[PDB]
């Protein structure tokens, strides 16, 4: 998928998580976020379209998604243990990383 | 190790997982696949040898192993929980990633 | 942070894990190591400043942190299961990755 589509997946599934009632819904939503974050790694944001895929900005962009993936991992395992409110809180701290990337590259 | 040898390791241990009887066997084979996928990620595939190392294709190639690694992660945790058939089903799901990369970069 | 600061974080927190009494201490040190490894991924080591950012050497460098991150993952889950001594053993194993990178790129 293209970058904007993966971002919609991330935004929609974060909201699913905030409204979720059980761990199965949280896990499903986090797994869709993980897929979207991985697919976004191959993308070039519009503000960097003319730069090298290996420029420091593009390597930083891709590390941003690795950071997000490890945060998704933490929430996924919290949900797996049945700690639904903890998984939802961990999902909320993802926004720190969403915003940090947006500030630089959106 | 070189890319062909790492792919040998991935294919051999996928077959071990398919025929395994117990969780320890599945977990051992998955651990070897994780190691091979990481070692493979540093390679330049022959199809991309004559392209720029800074090409989008090289970045995409490496994201494919990141997808594979997160799928291996799921199967590893299922095997760690002792869920042999669920871990085998998660390992079966790797094949779509294997073939999708091959279609582009073998 | 720069590479040297991230290396300090990794080394200091490994020392904490080596002297830890309980899983909470180990998990806290391992999460700080995970953050430093992700941050180090954006660095260029002095020895590779004369290489392309997409050169095989720089890919090897960045993938070395992926290897470390999955080893940090193993120790984190072992600590989460209450296997403190097994987590410490896994952190000891991590050191082979640190030294192998230093041998190549320091
Ligand atoms: C970089 C490492 C990013 C991370 C982490 C996240 N996002 Fe993002 N986002 C990024 C870019 C470069 C862009 C611009 C895309 C464009 O073509 O303009 C975006 C954009 C969005 C959008 C708007 C997309 C659209 O349809 O117009 C949304 C709704 C969005 N991002 C959400 C989002 C969330 C919820 C994230 C974390 C959970 C997140 N992004 C992470 C880069 C990066
Ligand atoms: C890209 C991200 C890949 C993923 C994921 C997987 N494979 Fe692969 N594979 C890839 C390439 C570029 C190549 C060509 C290597 C060459 O030098 O020609 C291969 C090759 C194989 C092979 C044949 C090896 C040989 O002796 O030539 C096998 C048996 C193989 N790959 C198996 C395999 C399996 C089982 C995978 C998923 C579990 C898998 N590969 C993923 C690129 C990528
Ligand atoms: C590459 C993939 C590395 C891995 C994995 C680890 N380290 Fe490292 N480290 C690396 C380099 C290239 C350098 C040289 C940095 C420089 O600017 O000279 C280092 C350096 C250190 C240092 C000293 C830094 C300084 O103050 O001069 C320490 C204490 C250190 N590294 C520790 C360390 C630990 C504990 C690691 C694993 C847990 C580890 N490093 C991994 C490259 C890489």
What keywords describe this structure?
homotrimer; electron transport (chains A, B, C); binds heme C; electron transfer activity (chains A, B, C); elongated; mainly alpha; signal (chains A, B, C); heme binding (chains A, B, C)
Architecture overview:
- Chains A, B, C: Keywords: Electron transport, Heme, Iron, Metal-binding, Periplasm, Signal, Transport.
- Chains A, B, C: GO terms for molecular function: electron transfer activity; heme binding; iron ion binding.
- Chains A, B, C: It is found in: Periplasm.
- Chains A, B, C: This is Soluble cytochrome b562.
- The structure is a homotrimer of 106-residue chains.
- With 106 residues, the first copy, chain A, is mainly alpha-helical.
- Helix content of chain A is 76%, strand content 0%.
- In chain A, helix 2 runs antiparallel to helix 3 and helix 3 runs antiparallel to helix 4.
- Chains in contact: A-B, A-C, B-C.
- At the A-B interface, helix 2 and helix 3 of A face helix 3 of B.
């Amino acid at each position: 998928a293209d970058l904007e589509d993966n971002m919609e997946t991330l935004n929609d599934n974060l909201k699913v998580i905030e409204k979720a009632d059980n761990a199965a819904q949280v896990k499903d939503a986090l797994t869709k976020m993980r897929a979207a974050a991985l697919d976004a790694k191959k993308a070039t944001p519009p503000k960097l379209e003319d730069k090298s895929p290996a420029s420091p900005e593009m390597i930083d962009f891709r590390v941003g998604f690795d950071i997000l993936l490890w945060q998704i991992h933490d929430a996924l395992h919290l949900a797996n243990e049945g700690k639904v409110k903890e998984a939802q809180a961990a999902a909320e701290q993802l926004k720190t990383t969403c915003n940090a990337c947006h500030q630089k590259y959106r």
